[PDB]
């Protein structure tokens, strides 16, 4: 009935094996799923084992009781999507979180940048400060407001890009939304990004 | 085989969404008929079936607001979800299966949106301190914006991030790019922001410091 799928993101480099696990909650109709961007999910493998039609030879699929394992053995960039185990044995029918494939390259440190709100904003009674991490590795970054140092929280927003594909790294917008009245209440604005690539915290600030 | 989800892009809170798939290359009344929806963040949710006989299924979760219906004389078949909250907002697929196999033939799915909002342009607000420079569009809706820079003749070392809805239920997003620290003082930045939905399009220098 619950489908566990680990992990949630899974680096690989291409031409290396790639293995993804699916614990069900209980004890045979487990298929696996592939999504590739900018398409439909497709069916890679039927009754635990068996390879569906079209599917290659490096994609296949095992496992004990409660315990299924997807491996794909060569890994290729066609291959780079998000993957889902599938029960269809009993109801209701259950797909596992989805395990995203994404590439392996050396850890990059974000080149960090802080925004003011313009001129033209601030007239019309908003303020919106803009944090950019850029060109970064791993994905995992944690970006904390810092308003005359108390740290912000419930009123920032990020978005990421997803994996480039030419360097294979991400970048992150963090926007902290203020009106203009608890704008002007204070001066300094810092965002403290945290990420592998950086031996410790780096901050970004300007005075209002 | 083909499968095709059609329906509204966008619908408002507590109304009920209709989505209809019209399938091709086989018939309803052989097999199993499936929607699946598949949430922001990639988290995909089975919601139900109407088989070959006529015969129902339900996910429990959706049970209480869901019914799945068909007209085999058109070989169509029909979801409606009564009661919609902002987090019924996804992509909507609807999907074949075969029995022993799984979900063989998929449609191409369809974006809906729960937004309580009416059709607003973006504002567009430059971001201004490798150096990075940016714009800022927000306060629109529906989706999608597009951006670019000077025209379209630069692309490299654009990012356009993924819009954010934001608590007020209008969208943001932030288009930045990275550029030579030396070319600040003597070369010039536009973002170019088209909002088709609302026939918005505006041009904004990016003015610095330097
Ligand atoms: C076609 C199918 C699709 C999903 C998987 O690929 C397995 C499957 O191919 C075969 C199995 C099939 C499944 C769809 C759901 C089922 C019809 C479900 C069920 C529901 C009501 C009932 O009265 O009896 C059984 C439990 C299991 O028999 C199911």
């Known amino acids: 009935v619950l489908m566990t799928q680990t992990p949630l993101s899974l680096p690989v480099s291409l031409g290396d094996q790639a293995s993804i696990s699916c614990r069900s909650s209980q004890s045979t109709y487990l298929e696996w799923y592939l999504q590739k961007p900018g398409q439909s999910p497709k069916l890679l493998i039927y009754?635990?084992?068996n390879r569906f039609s079209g599917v290659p030879d490096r994609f296949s699929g095992s496992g004990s009781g409660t315990d299924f394992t997807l491996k794909i053995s060569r890994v290729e960039a066609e291959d780079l999507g998000v993957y889902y185990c599938?029960?269809?044995?009993?109801?209701?029918?259950?797909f596992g979180a989805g395990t995203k494939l994404e590439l392996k390259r050396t850890v990059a440190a974000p080149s960090v940048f802080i925004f003011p709100p313009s001129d033209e904003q601030l007239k019309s009674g908003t303020a919106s400060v803009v944090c950019l991490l850029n060109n970064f590795y791993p994905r995992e970054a944690k970006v904390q407001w810092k308003v005359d140092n108390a740290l912000q929280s419930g009123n920032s927003q990020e978005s990421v890009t997803e994996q480039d594909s030419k360097d294979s790294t991400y970048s992150l917008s963090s926007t902290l939304t203020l009106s203009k009245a608890d704008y002007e209440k204070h001066k300094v604005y810092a965002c403290e990004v945290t990420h592998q690539g950086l031996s410790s915290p780096v901050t970004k600030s300007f005075n209002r | 085989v083909q499968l095709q989800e059609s329906g509204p892009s966008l619908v408002k809170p507590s109304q009920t969404l209709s989505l209809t798939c019209s399938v091709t290359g086989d018939s309803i009344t052989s097999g199993y008929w499936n929607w699946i929806r598949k949430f922001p963040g990639n988290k995909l949710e089975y919601m139900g079936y109407?088989?070959?006989?006529?015969?129902?299924y339900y996910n429990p979760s959706l049970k209480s607001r869901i019914s799945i219906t068909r007209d085999t004389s058109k070989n169509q078949y029909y979801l409606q979800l009564n009661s919609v909250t902002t987090e019924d907002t996804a992509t909507y697929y609807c999907?074949?299966?075969?029995?022993?196999?799984?979900?063989?033939?998929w449609g191409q799915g369809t974006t809906l949106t729960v937004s309580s909002a009416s059709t607003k342009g973006p504002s567009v607000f430059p971001l201004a301190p490798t150096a990075a420079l940016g714009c800022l569009v927000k306060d629109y809706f529906p989706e999608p914006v597009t951006v670019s820079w000077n025209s379209g003749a630069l692309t490299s070392g654009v990012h356009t991030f993924p819009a954010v809805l934001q608590s007020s239920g209008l969208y943001s997003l932030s288009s930045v790019v990275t550029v030579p620290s030396s070319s600040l003082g003597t070369k010039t930045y536009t973002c170019n922001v088209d909002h088709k939905p609302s026939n918005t399009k505006v041009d904004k220098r990016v003015e610095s410091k330097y």
């Open positions: 009754k635990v084992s």
């Open positions: 999907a074949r299966a075969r029995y022993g196999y799984g979900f063989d033939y």
């Open positions: 109407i088989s070959y006989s006529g015969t129902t």
């Open positions: 599938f029960q269809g044995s009993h109801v209701p029918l259950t």
